[PDB]
Amino acid sequence: DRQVGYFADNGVGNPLAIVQHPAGIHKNGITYVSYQGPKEDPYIASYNHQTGQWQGPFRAGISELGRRDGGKKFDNHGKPTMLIDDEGYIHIFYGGHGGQASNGKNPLGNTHHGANKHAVSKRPYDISQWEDLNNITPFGTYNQAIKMDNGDIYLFFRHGAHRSDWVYQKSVDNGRTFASPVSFLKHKRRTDIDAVDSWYAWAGKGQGDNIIVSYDYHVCWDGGAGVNGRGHTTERHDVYFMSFNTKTGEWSNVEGEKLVLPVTREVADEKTMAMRTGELWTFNGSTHLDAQGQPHIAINAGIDKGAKTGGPKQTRHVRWNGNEWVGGDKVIPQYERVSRGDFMVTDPENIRYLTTYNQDNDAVLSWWQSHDGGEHFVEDKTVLRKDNASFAISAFIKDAIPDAQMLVAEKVSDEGIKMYLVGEEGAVTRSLVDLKTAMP
Ligand SMILES: [Cl-]
Ligand SMILES: [K+]
Ligand SMILES: [Zn+2]
In this structure, the number of other CB atoms found within 10 A of the CB of residue 98 comes to 28
How far is the C-alpha of 114 from the C-alpha of 95, rounded, in Å?
Answer: 6
Query: Given the DSSP bridges, would you call strands 236-245 and 188-189 parallel, antiparallel or unpaired?
Result: unpaired
303-to-217, 224, 314 alpha-carbon distances in Å: 16, 22, 10
Q: Residue 368 is inside which H or E element, if any?
A: strand 362-370
How far is the C-alpha of 279 from the C-alpha of 139, rounded, in Å?
Answer: 31
How far is the C-alpha of 164 from the C-alpha of 187, rounded, in Å?
Answer: 5
Q: How far is the CA of 299 from the centre of ligand 3 (A)?
A: 19
Q: Taking the alpha carbons of 376, 379, 383, 388 in that order, is the dihedral positive or negative? A: positive
Which residues make beta-bridge pairs with 204?
212
How far is the C-alpha of 428 from the C-alpha of 403, rounded, in Å?
Answer: 7
Q: How far is the CA of 296 from the centre of ligand 2 (A)?
A: 17
CA 198-300-146 angle, 5° bins = 65
Q: Which ligand is nearest to the CA of 303?
A: 1
How far is the C-alpha of 31 from the C-alpha of 371, rounded, in Å?
Answer: 30
Q: How far is the CA of 342 from the centre of ligand 2 (A)?
A: 9
Cis previous bond, 348, omega within 30? no
Strands, DSSP E only, in 86-129?
Answer: 90-94, 117-121
Q: Is 84 helix (H, G, I), strand (E, B) or coil?
A: strand
Q: How far is the CA of 301 from the centre of ligand 2 (A)?
A: 13
Q: How far is the CA of 36 from the centre of ligand 3 (A)?
A: 25
Q: Which ligand is nearest to the CA of 392?
A: 2
Q: Are 218 and 198 in contact (CB under 8 A)?
A: yes
Q: Which ligand is nearest to the CA of 393?
A: 2
Cis previous bond, 22, omega within 30? yes
From the list 218, 86, 123, 114, the residue with the least C-alpha distance to 165 is 218
Q: Residue 390 is inside which H or E element, if any?
A: strand 390-393
Q: How far is the CA of 339 from the centre of ligand 2 (A)?
A: 9
The torsion angles phi and psi of 229, rounded to 5 degrees, stand at 65, 30
344-to-24, 52, 200, 296, 384 alpha-carbon distances in Å: 16, 26, 21, 9, 18
Q: How far is the CA of 311 from the centre of ligand 1 (A)?
A: 6
Identity of the residue numbered 205: K
How far is the C-alpha of 31 from the C-alpha of 415, rounded, in Å?
Answer: 24
Q: Which ligand is nearest to the CA of 407?
A: 2
Q: Which ligand is nearest to the CA of 112?
A: 3
Q: How far is the CA of 273 from the centre of ligand 3 (A)?
A: 20
Q: Residue 3 is inside which H or E element, if any?
A: strand 3-4
Catalytic (active-site) positions:
77, 142
Q: How far is the CA of 312 from the centre of ligand 1 (A)?
A: 4
Which residues make beta-bridge pairs with 207?
none
CA 107-76-428 angle, 5° bins = 130
